[PDB]
Write a protein that binds this DNA or RNA. Structure first.
Ligand SMILES: [Ca+2]
Ligand SMILES: [Ca+2]
Ligand SMILES: [Ca+2]
Ligand SMILES: [Ca+2]
Length: 281
DNA sequence: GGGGGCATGCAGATCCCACAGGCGCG
DNA sequence: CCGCGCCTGTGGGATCTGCATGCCCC
């Protein structure tokens, strides 16, 4: 059960990709709940165990027949999470949800949430957090601003990038029809972090940003399709900065196809065998 | 007696992932 | 011609996010 721990910057990078900070204010006088959660497919339960071993907090639960959840609600345990992200701060817009989550923690640590003044402040905090206030709290506390300080941060290091890639990244092989094999690396992200995704082009020395129609599409792609860039830049980066989860296994199969491509790929039966065991198994 | 915290289960919403096709260029 | 890589496009599920209840304890 007790599995390996992970580098704390890799964990923050995975949290930037897959984490969620929650502030629930329900009328059971109001009940206050703070939470951190990650939901993944069972294939990546090892990641949740890795985080649980590194933080030494959190409950791992099956969220159905297909999914697994790591959830932290115990108040003292949320202090462990604050201390981690204070030393290893998030990079995406989720940092703002973390900061509001931390602000809510100080209201509750000072027991102010038991009185009416604390609830009003917690409602103001929740308004700027994630998807904002629900209809009931919008009516019961109409005083309601969703605006919050802007975030525009740079990639802190490659260890963060490995955890981020383990979450939102993708390694795959294309078989285009004469059949040619092409390696592709892609990270997708909501356009709310376009600057950070643009940051990747010079940070990795390769790649392009693709957006489609910016007026009707809320997410973009950072992609590297040039084999020399995959072979000389992306592979050495993630070989030195270990990925986690099945993304690591997909990367290792990905690199097997890369060695074949640098050795005159065209023969192809072994590449098709590796591809069958990638994002299908 | 019960307020408040914790665990728990489930549902809503969407941002991802893992791709494919057309075609200009060296 | 051939192999490549820019560029455009996306289904649908793995995510992110949120709601509700029960039971314990000081
Ligand atoms: Ca993400
Ligand atoms: Ca993310
Ligand atoms: Ca993921
Ligand atoms: Ca993700």
């Amino acid at each position: 059960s007790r599995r390996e721990s992970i580098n704390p910057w890799i964990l923050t990078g995975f949290a930037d990709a897959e984490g969620s900070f929650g502030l629930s204010i329900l009328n059971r006088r109001y009940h206050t709940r703070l939470s951190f959660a990650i939901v993944l497919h069972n294939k990546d339960k090892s990641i949740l165990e890795n985080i649980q071993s590194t933080w030494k907090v959190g409950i791992i639960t099956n969220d159905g027949d297909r999914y697994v959840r790591l959830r932290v609600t115990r108040f003292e345990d949320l202090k462990v999470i604050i201390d981690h992200f204070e030393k290893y701060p998030l990079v995406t817009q989720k940092l703002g949800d973390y900061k509001l989550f931390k602000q809510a923690f100080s209201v509750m640590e000072n027991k102010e949430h038991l009185k009416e003044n604390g609830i009003k402040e917690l409602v103001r905090i929740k308004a700027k957090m994630n998807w904002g206030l629900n209809d009931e709290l919008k009516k019961a506390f109409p005083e309601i601003s969703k605006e919050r300080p802007l975030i525009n941060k740079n990639i802190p290091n490659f260890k963060w990038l490995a955890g981020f890639t383990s979450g939102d990244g993708s390694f795959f092989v294309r078989l285009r029809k004469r059949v040619r094999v092409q390696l592709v690396f892609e990270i997708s992200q909501h356009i709310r972090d376009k600057n950070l995704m643009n940051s990747l082009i010079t940070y990795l020395g390769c790649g392009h940003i693709y957006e489609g129609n910016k007026s009707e599409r809320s997410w973009l792609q950072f992609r590297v399709e040039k084999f020399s860039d995959i072979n000389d830049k992306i592979i050495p980066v993630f070989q030195e900065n270990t990925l986690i989860g099945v993304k690591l296994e997909d990367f290792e199969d990905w690199c097997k196809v890369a060695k074949l491509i640098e050795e005159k790929k065209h023969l192809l039966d072994e590449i098709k065998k590796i591809k069958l065991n990638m994002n299908k198994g």
